[PDB]
Amino acid sequence: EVKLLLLGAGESGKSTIVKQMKIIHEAGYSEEECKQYKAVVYSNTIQSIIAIIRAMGRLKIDFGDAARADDARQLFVLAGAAEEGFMTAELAGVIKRLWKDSGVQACFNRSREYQLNDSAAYYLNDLDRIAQPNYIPTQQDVLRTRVKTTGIVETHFTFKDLHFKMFDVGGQRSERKKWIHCFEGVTAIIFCVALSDYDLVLMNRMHESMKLFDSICNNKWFTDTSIILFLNKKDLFEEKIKKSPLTICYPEYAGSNTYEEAAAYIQCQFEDLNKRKDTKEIYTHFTCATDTKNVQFVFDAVTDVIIKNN
Amino acid sequence: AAREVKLLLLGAGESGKSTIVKQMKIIHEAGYSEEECKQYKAVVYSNTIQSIIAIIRAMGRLKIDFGDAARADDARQLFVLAMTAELAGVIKRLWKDSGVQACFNRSREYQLNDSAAYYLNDLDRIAQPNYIPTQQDVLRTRVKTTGIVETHFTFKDLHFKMFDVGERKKWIHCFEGVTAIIFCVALSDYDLAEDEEMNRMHESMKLFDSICNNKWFTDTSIILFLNKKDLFEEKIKKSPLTICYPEYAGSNTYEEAAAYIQCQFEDLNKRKDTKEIYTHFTCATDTKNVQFVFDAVTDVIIKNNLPDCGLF
Ligand SMILES: Nc1nc2c(ncn2[C@@H]2O[C@H](COP(=O)(O)OP(=O)(O)O)[C@@H](O)[C@H]2O)c(=O)[nH]1
Numbered sequence: 001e002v003k004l005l006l007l008g009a010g011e012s013g014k015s016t017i018v019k020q021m022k023i024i025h026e027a028g029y030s031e032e033e034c035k036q037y038k039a040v041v042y043s044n045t046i047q048s049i050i051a052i053i054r055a056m057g058r059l060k061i062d063f064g065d066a067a068r069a070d071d072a073r074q075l076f077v078l079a080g081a082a083e084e085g086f087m088t089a090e091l092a093g094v095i096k097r098l099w100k101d102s103g104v105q106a107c108f109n110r111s112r113e114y115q116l117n118d119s120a121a122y123y124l125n126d127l128d129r130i131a132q133p134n135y136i137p138t139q140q141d142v143l144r145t146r147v148k149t150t151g152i153v154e155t156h157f158t159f160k161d162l163h164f165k166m167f168d169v170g171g172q173r174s175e176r177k178k179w180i181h182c183f184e185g186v187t188a189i190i191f192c193v194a195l196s197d198y199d200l201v202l203m204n205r206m207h208e209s210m211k212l213f214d215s216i217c218n219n220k221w222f223t224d225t226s227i228i229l230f231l232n233k234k235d236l237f238e239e240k241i242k243k244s245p246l247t248i249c250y251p252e253y254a255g256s257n258t259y260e261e262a263a264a265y266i267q268c269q270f271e272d273l274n275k276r277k278d279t280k281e282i283y284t285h286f287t288c289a290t291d292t293k294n295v296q297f298v299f300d301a302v303t304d305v306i307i308k309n310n
Numbered sequence: 311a312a313r314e315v316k317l318l319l320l321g322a323g324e325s326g327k328s329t330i331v332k333q334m335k336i337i338h339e340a341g342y343s344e345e346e347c348k349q350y351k352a353v354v355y356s357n358t359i360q361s362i363i364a365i366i367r368a369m370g371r372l373k374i375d376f377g378d379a380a381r382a383d384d385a386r387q388l389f390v391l392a393m394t395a396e397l398a399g400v401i402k403r404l405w406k407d408s409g410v411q412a413c414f415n416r417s418r419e420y421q422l423n424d425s426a427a428y429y430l431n432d433l434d435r436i437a438q439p440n441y442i443p444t445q446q447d448v449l450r451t452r453v454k455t456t457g458i459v460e461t462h463f464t465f466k467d468l469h470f471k472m473f474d475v476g477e478r479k480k481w482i483h484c485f486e487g488v489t490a491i492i493f494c495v496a497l498s499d500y501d502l503a504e505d506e507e508m509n510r511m512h513e514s515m516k517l518f519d520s521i522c523n524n525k526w527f528t529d530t531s532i533i534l535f536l537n538k539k540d541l542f543e544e545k546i547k548k549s550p551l552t553i554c555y556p557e558y559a560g561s562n563t564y565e566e567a568a569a570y571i572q573c574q575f576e577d578l579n580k581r582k583d584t585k586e587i588y589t590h591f592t593c594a595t596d597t598k599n600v601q602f603v604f605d606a607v608t609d610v611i612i613k614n615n616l617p618d619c620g621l622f
């Protein structure tokens with residue numbers, strides 16, 4: 001029986017990794033279980049479009065089809081009386097026309113300049129499928145779900161004759177930091193880093209993640225804890241690096257803005273934080289948390305290592 | 311912030327901690343929507359199944375026979391069949407058998423969910439192919455808590471953070487600035503964990519003794535919830551408190567037994583001069599009572615554990 005502790009800044013993907021464990025080892029999501037997330041998908045979806053639109057204002061930008069001005073105001077009024085767990089084709093229509101707007105899509109691409117759900121685009125596009133009244137959220141839909149984790153979530157599953165007891169720690173900064181403390185001496189830690197946070201001006205979000213990793217990695221609490229590093233959201237990174245310069249996050253970066261090199265660099269910047277390199281090793285994997293195939297492959301490796309290290 | 315309140319739910323398990331949690335959602339936020347409830351259809355069924363199963367499976371250990379020998383058939387199916395309107399049938403019939411009912415009445419002899427009768431006596435409306443469980447049905451569900459559950463709610467201009475730990479031991483101390491502890495006690499447990507050392511009540515007492523006197527919570531208000539008083543109100547009429555406190559010489563009446571049990575718990579406070587215990591007789595499943603109780607709880611927190619910040 002092993003105790004794995006998902007760690008890392010919010011939105012790095014701890015939760016998504018939990019679901020993948022469910023989907024990959026125990027059973028997954030019954031058409032029944034999925035139905036549960038209908039309200040979350042709607043919530044996320046509406047949240048995504050509102051954010052983008054409410055951003056057009058600040059970033060000073062006009063809608064494509066001048067008429068979308070009506071749908072904009074409509075969006076809000078309909079978001080208020082929204083009966084969670086169900087979305088009206090009326091609202092479904094408002095979002096749809098807005099998402100297909102020239103100026104709105106322009107704001108969407110200027111996404112880094114504000115806060116926007118990673119899943120924003122994924123849901124919005126599939127809006128036709130999701131707007132249906134009988135719509136049953138797919139496993140991917142569930143995986144793309146974004147819900148702030150509170151308290152500590154604990155999942156169980158057996159893999160390779162091993163009883164895994166995983167832990168995702170939500171809660172505020174301090175008590176979280178304090179909960180981590182009562183987690184000193186865990187079999188393993190899977191620290192997640194959202195690679196796509198390099199170009200975000202949230203200190204830098206990436207450096208923040210780094211600072212956090214530095215603490216966990218060189219912390220006396222985990223001197224016998226397999227520090228596993230998930231350089232996650234590699235997909236969003238790839239689509240992003242070809243437009244945004246890694247320099248934004250690392251001015252001391254001489255390489256080129258290409259997935260391979262930049263990714264490699266980020267991995268370097270994190271691994272370099274490890275002080276006791278001769279004593280303890282960092283097991284890294286570039287991941288796409290939402291990608292089940294990727295995560296199974298990756299978790300396979302994590303297990304193997306876990307097995308040896310003990 | 312001064313208007314931040316950290317609440318920790320403690321107690322023995324099946325003592326009503328999560329029921330309080332569920333209640334905080336129903337009272338201070340929205341409650342369980344038609345959809346959300348539908349989510350619990352399964353647990354309500356499993357709860358129901360393991361309950362009737364627990365009864366039958368116990369008839370044996372207690373040398374009990376079915377009323378009408380015809381049920382022995384349904385007994386067989388129940389197992390080799392585990393909801394279908396067929397299952398609903400084997401249940402209803404078994405739930406009516408005199409012998410079963412008699413086994414159900416000796417529940418203290420074995421382990422049985424407290425919502426057993428509730429569900430079973432409502433099996434019809436429940437087994438309905440178009441069953442949408444009620445908040446109450448949700449409230450009566452039983453499902454082990456894992457990890458740490460957290461609930462946020464604003465009430466009386468206070469921002470509450472309530473925690474329920476899933477077993478729970480060194481994690482209770484893993485909290486900082488805990489404003490208050492709501493310790494739950496299952497009153498109806500007096501006449502019955504594992505018949506190992508002491509009975510549930512004494513277990514709970516050990517638990518409370520440990521917490522009530524812990525110096526880590528010296529600045530934490532100790533709220534005691536003598537819970538499941540509704541179930542307690544019934545058992546005291548047909549089961550002596552002596553089963554739990556052999557030295558008990560009082561009458562087996564709600565009022566007297568309840569007071570006694572309160573005393574046994576409050577006596578444990580080894581710091582009567584400095585630390586006060588705020589006791590409440592509750593029915594975690596009763597939304598009305600919970601809010602009433604919780605309203606009193608906050609006034610206590612406001613009036614005893616908060617800086618002069620404006621609420622009092
Ligand atoms: N595109 C993409 N999205 C991801 C990936 N991992 C997580 N997400 C999404 O990013 C958001 C945050 O994920 P979550 O697990 O909640 O992060 P957490 O707060 O660290 O637990 C959710 O919408 C996830 O579905 C990924 O690798 N690629």
Ligand SMILES: Nc1nc2c(ncn2[C@@H]2O[C@H](COP(=O)(O)OP(=O)(O)O)[C@@H](O)[C@H]2O)c(=O)[nH]1
Nearest residue numbers: 323324325326327328329449450451538593594
């Ligand atoms: N009738 C009745 N049932 C209760 C009461 N409190 C809790 N229950 C039930 O007792 C069972 C266990 O409660 P739960 O909150 O899970 O206890 P926990 O293990 O301390 O969290 C559930 O079926 C609850 O619905 C009560 O006050 N009256």
